[PDB]
Amino acid sequence: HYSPFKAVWDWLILLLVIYTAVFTPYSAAFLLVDLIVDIMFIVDILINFRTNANEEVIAVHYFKGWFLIDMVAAIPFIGLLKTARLLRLVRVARKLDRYSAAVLFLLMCTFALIAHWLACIWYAIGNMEIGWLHNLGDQIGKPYGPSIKDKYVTALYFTFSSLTSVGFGNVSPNTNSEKIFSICVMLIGSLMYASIFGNVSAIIQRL
């Protein structure tokens, strides 16, 4: 567990799991390359196979430590049922002494992630039917729809604003489902802002 190879390959699977977490929710939400991350995530299990509290040291371990989780994570087969891919996030779950100025990129990454997830949730809501998308259609010169890029960037925009507590006013919740989601995103924004943006301050302080 102390090799000049384990480190580089672990950071490689880190980049690959960020790939997963950034491109499965978008894909599943908006419009619902990856075989290589499949191959690396199924090489990770065997890399555990080839690599005690009191002292130093493997196969039945995963049979009881973490396998069925990883099995339902990566297993081929409705196009919705791909959501279970997100289970791969657990790969960033149990290595947190060999992942942590890296914490700063991690914090920016997770903030952007939460913004992305809330953006796609917001898109699902606004597409489950006065709302917001009938409005975004009218703001820009696209009345009726808009291109997928316009929708995604406006969703990420509104989510990022109402998270950072600005509220530009071009995008405004106007239906009880939207308003309840807004109360929830404002709760999450209060909590996450208060925690992580004092966190970043303390990080830059100790440096």
Place this chain on the structure above:
Amino acid sequence: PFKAVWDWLILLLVIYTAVFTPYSAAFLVDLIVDIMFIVDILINFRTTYVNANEEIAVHYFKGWFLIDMVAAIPGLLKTARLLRLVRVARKLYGAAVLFLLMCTFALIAHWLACIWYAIGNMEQPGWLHNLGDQIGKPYPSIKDKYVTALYFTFSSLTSVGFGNVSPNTNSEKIFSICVMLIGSLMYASIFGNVSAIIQRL
């Protein structure tokens, strides 16, 4: 050990009271909790205590009685029920205190939501008439009129200001001065702990 379990049950119950009482008074099951909250008094009668050095009648007679029974009696006069809140005040984990603080915030948002509803209702010769026009019910069920109230209250309290709700009549504007004054205090008092305890967790 059962005293502690029972106290937590009654804490759930008093949160129930504080959540569903002001809503009932302003915008508008009861007996099952009122029986528990009146036998609360008999429980206080049997309940023990420790003295300063020497480790019940005069005890509760002087602790809180002229404020318990006034609310513990089976219309607006019912509002005095809110005094049950002090029940938690006497009887005070991270995963518990954080939930507590989030509950204070949600409760404050609720109280201010119903005050705002009262204020917007005292004038029908504003924001209410300036609400039913966004939503396609021009003139509004209690679901809407409550949810936009909580929406605006959370907006102003978290300092977002979305731009649908806008105080537009002097009483509303004074209410806004007040909520922003306390809200600036809340964000600078409440989130003075969510961003302060985390070193412990």
Place this chain on the structure above:
Amino acid sequence: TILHYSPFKAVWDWLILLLVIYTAVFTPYSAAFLIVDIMFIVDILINFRYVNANEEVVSHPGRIAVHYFKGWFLIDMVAAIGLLKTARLLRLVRVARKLDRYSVLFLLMCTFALIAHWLACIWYAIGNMEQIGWLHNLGDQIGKPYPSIKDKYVTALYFTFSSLTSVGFGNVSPNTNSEKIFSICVMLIGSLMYASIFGNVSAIIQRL
């Protein structure tokens, strides 16, 4: 020969600070939109009849006047007297040399409020100085087109609080160059204030 730490001047000075608060709230409000003087002027001899640097409260009140002339007397003569009552704001400097005898939340709340007050008065002075803007647009929100004194003052206080606490409700939107630059200034001072004063609030809440 009267002293400073007397239980008499304590209450009287709390009353005169209530009075200087009275002024600071009522002199800008007066020009922007009799006993109040005898107390402040009598304070000249109340302070006449102190403590030296490395000495006690020295008696023989003839060693008092020169010390006073050293400490604080000059602009106080303009204080104890067109828009010349603007000079009454110099009464505020009295709490300057007296602020040490107070120590706390209430001072902070009051100063946030009265800073908002001064800025409301300046915002009104700007909106009225140019005769499309903001005050010639408020008349369309309410049903007063072309507005009382109460209405204008309360909207100005509303907008000043909105900008100082970073809400921005959207019905007060600076729309001419003077207003925009004043808004740059208020947002800078707000980024200063909401930071400083409210870190102070956090610390005070910590102490208790």
Place this chain on the structure above:
Amino acid sequence: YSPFKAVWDWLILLLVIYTAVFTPYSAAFLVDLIVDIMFIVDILINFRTTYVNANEEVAVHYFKGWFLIDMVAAIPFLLKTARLLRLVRVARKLDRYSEYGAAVLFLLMCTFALIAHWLACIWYAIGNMEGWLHNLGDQIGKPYPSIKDKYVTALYFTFSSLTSVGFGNVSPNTNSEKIFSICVMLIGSLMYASIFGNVSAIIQRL
């Protein structure tokens, strides 16, 4: 580090601030050789100046680590933007400025102001490439604006987005502006918090 420099260094600080303020503003929307002269005298003053060493005691120095930048900036040759390189000069001296907190506060406020300025220039570039200028031309009664407006409203919106107020008169409404606003909200989320924690701390030092 002479007393002559113990004043002329703050003088060249004012000069580099002048440049950082008037070079982007000149390149964006649209006395000079005078400041080029001071810039070219500084390097010679450094030539006859001193240099230090860790275990030892205090012309090729300019050849050592800081050579082509001071050169490429001190030439009166969208192009003159090169001058902005001069900025690095302040980095070369912060070991002596920050001794005065009463000065570092002014430094931080000027940092915030400068960032607001550069972002105002970027915002104007984005709006002027091909919007929000059409949305400005209608509030101010000048439909189609004098550069005074187009600049001060841009600085206004930039201070808004960076201070998290969002007055809602001007608002991003075309994908490029939206992405710029994402970036400005993020850079604000960084700098606001960090620099104003710094403000709280330094103002607390009294």
